[PDB]
């Protein structure tokens, strides 16, 4: 568990980085799968967050792995880690040609069939509306095909690394999905299913008719990205390239740079309305050309096609969260020669996008300084009319919690750190004064909310509450006097503390570079966060840092009803019956063999929250990269 670090006082941030790096990479510690070398969500298996099992992982984890290795190359001159990390990503979570059969049959003039989204999972399956609803046209596909051929070079968002659900073979890493039934489907409320749907498992039509209603069903494959992962990966590779070339070792990462540029080009798919409807339509009004482009990183792009028959489809997404933007990666794709898109229009599109993203952050900045949630081009996920008085951004409606409501997607303070960290890197590398007010207001805000205790502990915001709306955007920040944040709780989340330290140190470095005076308070706060995270949460088992958390939410293992339509029946691969009346655990009965099951169940029987220790991959990496940023800009 967490203990006071034995580390000698005054240990350099470089030395801290290299110690923590070593512990992350040590095979005995178990952060990576023995067979593929894929980073798990966490060492521990019983954990329920975005993934619902700890050895399920996400494209996020793959991106953090690349970032870790880039910093290692910076500090040691050894670039093999970057090569290895990108290879693991490309080999596993980026679907290859055999895994995207028939994508060459995609028709950009008939991209997909329309379906409503709904406010509760019990409304699903959602009817596919063939020939009742016309959709718009995809203006980027052919430009990408001309450069790269038929397939998407993006990461699917979720992978069952040791085939725990059984949808794949042996213990092989397997593409899966969970979330599918709208904004109120929490992680506790999903029915896990295979991305490659061969009807082997589930019901007669596999899992398909839990989610979509149609006259017939065909075997099919489907992937969905999370563009913050790709963005982070590319961001990392910008730094790998910069640092490697400083060392005269740019050739070691040149191939990875080319792949990152390509991935960046494919992220243009995330810039479009779900069904290529006109931005601002407030109706199901199909667009052509770029009239469906919001030029933000929306929550996903998804694509799919047939197995055993040749057909394909693609959707964007109408919802954008500030937390998923990355104007740094955008600027890299737009402006950096080595990352120049191979397609004819990628550079232009990215130039438009990174600037639009920067406006988005400004529009969303509350009176206090925290960044509010985002916007949608599809009110209620059904292209409904905006309510009276709705504030807008280029025709998109403000929403405080884009995409998901259980919990509200902008309650989590962590998005402030993850996303504004990218804005700091953008300011550092450009000195663009257009974002100075944004970043200074956010820094002064966040630093007013960090608590440093005389006993050497710390607290940072954990949960946020929002009221009001920004003013409608006309190109200039108004101060948004009626958009308000309140911090409702604080905590010691190690990864957020690291990300925040990263943001503050990067900002400090930028102030030194551009402003003629270093913000030493920002520098020092970054140092304090790293120091206090490391010192108070050092893992006694030598695995890095570790949390100790009461998980009151884990009563949902046993209490959460999972919606199944009346009359539907099927089985999970292990034989668990999927039918009305199931709870979370009932379709995941292998959890009863987890080494921490008894602790969680016995706590439940006592009416108590169980207390668990976790080593999340992204926690370890966000802290390590923060140590590295300090080492880079503030050595000694
Ligand atoms: O010719 C016949 C063809 O007909 C066939 C029809 O084919 C169908 C095609 O269209 C189908 C329409 O389907 C709609 C698809 O939309 C659903 C998308 O669902 C997948 C979305 O995946 C995204 C998952 O999102 C959840 C991830 O959120 C994580 C939040 O991040 C926060 C992480 O921070 C950790 C916090 O830690 C807290 C610890 O205290």
Residue numbers in the entry: 28 to 663
From the paper:
Family 48 glucosyl hydrolases (GH48s) are exoglucanases that attack cellulose chains from the reducing ends to progressively release cellobiose molecule, thereby playing crucial roles in the hydrolysis of crystalline cellulose. Subsequently, Cel48S was defined as a family 48 cellulase because it contains a GH48-catalyzing domain with reducing end-acting cellobiohydrolase activity and a type I dockerin domain for assembly.
The crystal structure of the purified ctCel48S_CD protein was determined at 1.43Å obtaining final Rwork and Rfree values of 0.1601 and 0.1930, respectively. The crystal structure showed one molecule in an asymmetric unit. We observed conformational changes of three important residues: the substrate-binding residues R249 and Y431, and the catalytic residue E87. The side chain of E87 deviated approximately 3.7 Å from that of the substrate-bound rCel48S_CD, which resulted in an increasing distance (from 2.8 Å to 6.0 Å) between the carboxylate oxygen of E87 and C4 hydroxyl of glucosyl residues at subsite + 1. The side chain of residue R249 in the ctCel48S_CD structure showed apparent conflicts with the substrate based on the published rCel48S_CD-oligosaccharide complex structure. Because the ctCel48S_CD structure was substrate- and product-free compared with the published rCel48S_CD structure, these results indicated that the residue conformation of the Cel48S protein may differ as the substrate-binding status changes, indicating that induced-fit effects may occur between the enzyme and substrates.
